[PDB]
Amino acid sequence: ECTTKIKP
Amino acid sequence: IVGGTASVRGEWPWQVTLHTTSPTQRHLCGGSIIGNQWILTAAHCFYGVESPKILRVYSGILNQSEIKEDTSFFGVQEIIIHDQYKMAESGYDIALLKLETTVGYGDSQRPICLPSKGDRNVIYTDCWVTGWGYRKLRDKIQNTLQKAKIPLVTNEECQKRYRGHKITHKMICAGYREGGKDACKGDSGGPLSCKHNEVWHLVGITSWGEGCAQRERPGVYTNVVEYVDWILEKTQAV
Amino acid sequence: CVNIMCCRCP
Ligand SMILES: [N+]
Ligand SMILES: [N+]
Ligand SMILES: [N+]
Known part of the structure; x- marks a missing residue:
């Protein structure tokens, strides 16, 4: 999906 | 835009x-x-x-x-x-x-994807500023979301163009030497997005600049990687 | 506009 992850 | x-x-x-x-x-x-x-x-x-x-x-x-x-x-x-x-x-x-x-x-x-802190070594070649702002000084908000492609410029050259202001490393500049394409009233806070290896990254945040699209005065954006x-x-x- | 550097803001 993506390299810098943001928590939901 | x-x-x-x-x-x-x-x-x-x-x-x-x-x-x-x-x-x-x-x-x-x-x-x-x-x-x-x-x-x-x-x-x-x-x-x-x-x-x-x-x-x-x-x-x-x-x-x-x-x-x-x-x-x-x-x-x-x-x-x-x-x-x-x-x-x-x-x-x-x-x-x-x-x-x-x-x-x-x-x-x-x-x-949209943030930059990877190991990828400041990247020189982005496909960057776009987007927004509903003016296409013109003293205009109105544009109805349809506008896009414009602009080349990033070195902090060295952005500094040379902006005497009197300190252009820190946590800033990033983009614009054509001749002007003509830039963000303008209403576009601030919008992204400067750059396609790299088929993946869009949020490289900058529109934040200030002398007027709009004035020649030899690139736009200044918060340099998001920093x-x-x-x-x-x-x-x-x- | 007051500040030429804030024409793309507000
Ligand atoms: N549409
Ligand atoms: N700096
Ligand atoms: N103003």
Whole structure:
């Protein structure tokens, strides 16, 4: 999906 | 966006329009979806905003005229300003909106990817500034989300063009030597997005510049990579 | 406008 992850 | 052209539904699914309801409802700023409850925009957007009760975040919008009094919008639970921000021209022009409700993702609204802190070595060659702002000094808000492609310029050359201001490493500049294409009133807080290896990254946040598209005066954007750690501290809170 | 550097803001 993506390299810098943001928590939901 | 000066010198830009219209976008099509779904082209910039992360661009959102940030509205204020006082004294009137009005488009205030661009912003970028960076996660299912997080909008990355500019801190300057909130001078004179004393409560998040008066903010409406609108996603999946191609046309400002899509918004009417029954249109869904995302409420803003919290405003996070970088604690060292004072002015756009002084850097730290970054801010997070924590929304009251989760965002669903679809072809019309999708998050954009932050840069990887190991990829400042990257020289981006496909960068676009987007927004509903003026195409013209003393204009009106544009109806259809506009896009314009602009080349990044070195901090060296941006500094040479901006005597009197310190261009810090946490800033990034972009524009054509001759002018003609730039952000303008209404586009601030919007993204400067760059396609790399088929993946869009949110490289900058529109924040200031001398006038609009004036020649040998590139636009200044918060250099997003330099705050990734900061973003995570706020978005991974425990 | 007051500040030429804030023409793309507000
Ligand atoms: N459309
Ligand atoms: N610097
Ligand atoms: N102004």
